[PDB]
Homo-oligomer: A and B are copies of this chain.
Amino acid sequence: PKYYRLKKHLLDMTRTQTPGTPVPPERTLAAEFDTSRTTVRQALQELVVEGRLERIQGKGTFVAKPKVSQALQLTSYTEDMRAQGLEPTSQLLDIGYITADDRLAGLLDITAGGRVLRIERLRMANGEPMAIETTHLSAKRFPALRRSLVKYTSLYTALAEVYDVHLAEAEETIETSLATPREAGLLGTDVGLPMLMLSRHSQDRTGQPVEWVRSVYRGDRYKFVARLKR
């Protein structure tokens, strides 16, 4: 009751206020509406996750820009950021070989203990981290892939030119996830901010598995768009 109108005014204070506007202090809001101070957290955290507010860990919480959009599709992260007026940067967090547990093997259609190239990228937009993306490929199926990536910006450019392998279909899973400590750290958010967790099974033009990708997108700043028929 006291909660709804609170949310309603706050929701209406976005819409119109431009990003950067500081949100009134949580303890001020509790009195300005004679509501409990936890009822204020709730309303605010909803509006952070719903993307109208944004928490800056040193500074505070402010009216936010709309969430960044990306199409549910095998497509360019760079082209989509740019189309929205955002400079896209990436950062190679790690790249190394590992050995699959039995299921990563099931995914990659390789033997337990099989060697796997792993790649972790931090995706940025205007220099603000948005996602962490971890890609797994069968090292044996792609003998010297890492060494070849030196001379390439796009992993999928590398696979097409060098291995004559093109992504042709993917099964993709979208679900919720809380930001783990390691995740929150790389992304500069709270533990555990709600996340969009994407899992991608990709197969090429002759139908064999190419990669398995595990990705978490900031739930406060990100959304995905799908376009459907009939």
Q: How distant is the Cα of A39 from the Cα of B75 in the complex, in angstroms?
A: 39
The contact string, 1 if C-beta is below 8 Å from chain B, for chain A 169-189, is 111111111101100000000
Of B50, B170, B195, B228, which one neighbours A72 at CB under 8 angstroms?
Answer: B228
Chain B residue contacts of A72, Cβ below 8 A: 72, 174, 226, 228
Q: How distant is the Cα of A125 from the Cα of B75 in the complex, in angstroms?
A: 34
Chain B residue contacts of A176, Cβ below 8 A: 49, 176, 194-196, 219-220, 223
Cβ–Cβ contact B3 & A173, under 8 A: no
A93 adjacent to chain B (CB < 8 Å): no
Cβ–Cβ contact A174 & B174, under 8 A: yes
* CB nearest to A179 among chain B residues: B46
Chain B residue contacts of A73, Cβ below 8 A: 228
A42 adjacent to chain B (CB < 8 Å): yes
Greatest chain B CB density within 10 A among A3, A7, A50, A174 is at A174
Cβ–Cβ contact A226 & B192, under 8 A: no
The interface size of chain A toward B, counting residues with CB under 8 Å, comes to: 45
Interface SS, A side: strand
Of B42, B169, B227, which one neighbours A191 at CB under 8 angstroms?
Answer: B42
Which residues of A in the span 51-69 have a Cβ within 8 Å of any Cβ on B? Answer: 51, 67, 69
A168 adjacent to chain B (CB < 8 Å): yes
Of B169, B181, B194, B225, which one neighbours A173 at CB under 8 angstroms?
Answer: B225
Cβ–Cβ contact A51 & B196, under 8 A: no
Which residues of A in the span 31-89 have a Cβ within 8 Å of any Cβ on B? Answer: 42, 45-46, 49-51, 67, 69, 72-75
Cβ–Cβ contact B227 & A169, under 8 A: yes
A151 adjacent to chain B (CB < 8 Å): no
Of B167, B171, B180, B196, which one neighbours A174 at CB under 8 angstroms?
Answer: B196
Chain B residue contacts of A227, Cβ below 8 A: 169-172
* CB nearest to A72 among chain B residues: B226
Chain B residue contacts of A191, Cβ below 8 A: 42
Closest 10 interchain pairs by CB?
Answer: A176-B219, A175-B223, A194-B194, A176-B194, A170-B228, A172-B226, A174-B224, A46-B178, A49-B178, A74-B228
